[PDB]
């Protein structure tokens, strides 16, 4: 009788621990996906900003050269 109680409690605990492990795996997967998406977003932002700052640099040097020619 005590053996059946031990077995039932152990099976219940193992089922709950399986649920907890599935939840942990799902949460870690979602966190990995979101962290990687934000990493790609930051990298795309840095690349686009490098392009934009290069464009601004070119335009500003051109404007400075025009001003030098004028004055």
């Amino acid at each position: 009788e005590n053996q059946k109680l031990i077995a039932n409690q152990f099976n219940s605990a193992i089922g709950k621990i399986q649920d907890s492990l599935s939840s942990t795996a799902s949460a870690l997967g979602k966190l990995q996906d979101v962290v990687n998406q934000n990493a790609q977003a930051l990298n795309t932002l840095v690349k686009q900003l490098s392009s934009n700052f290069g464009a601004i640099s070119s335009v500003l040097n051109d404007i400075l050269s025009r001003l030098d020619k004028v004055e």
Binding site: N2, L5, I6, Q9, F10, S12, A13, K16, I17, D19, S20, S23, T24, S26, A27, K30, L31, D33, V34, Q37, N38, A41, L42, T44, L45, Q48, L49, S51, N52, A55, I56, V59
Partner: protein
């Protein structure tokens, strides 16, 4: 004489997603609380 229009690269499309794992945290805490119902009392 003329001057061109300086069009800068658009970055508005860059977006950062948000994570929603509150269901999993709630399930973990619920299981941590429910494991008291699995303790053996001989």
């Amino acid at each position: 004489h003329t001057s061109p229009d300086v069009d800068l690269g658009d970055i508005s499309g860059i977006n950062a997603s948000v994570v929603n794992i509150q269901k999993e945290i709630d399930r973990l805490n619920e299981v941590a609380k429910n494991l008291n119902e699995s303790l053996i009392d001989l």
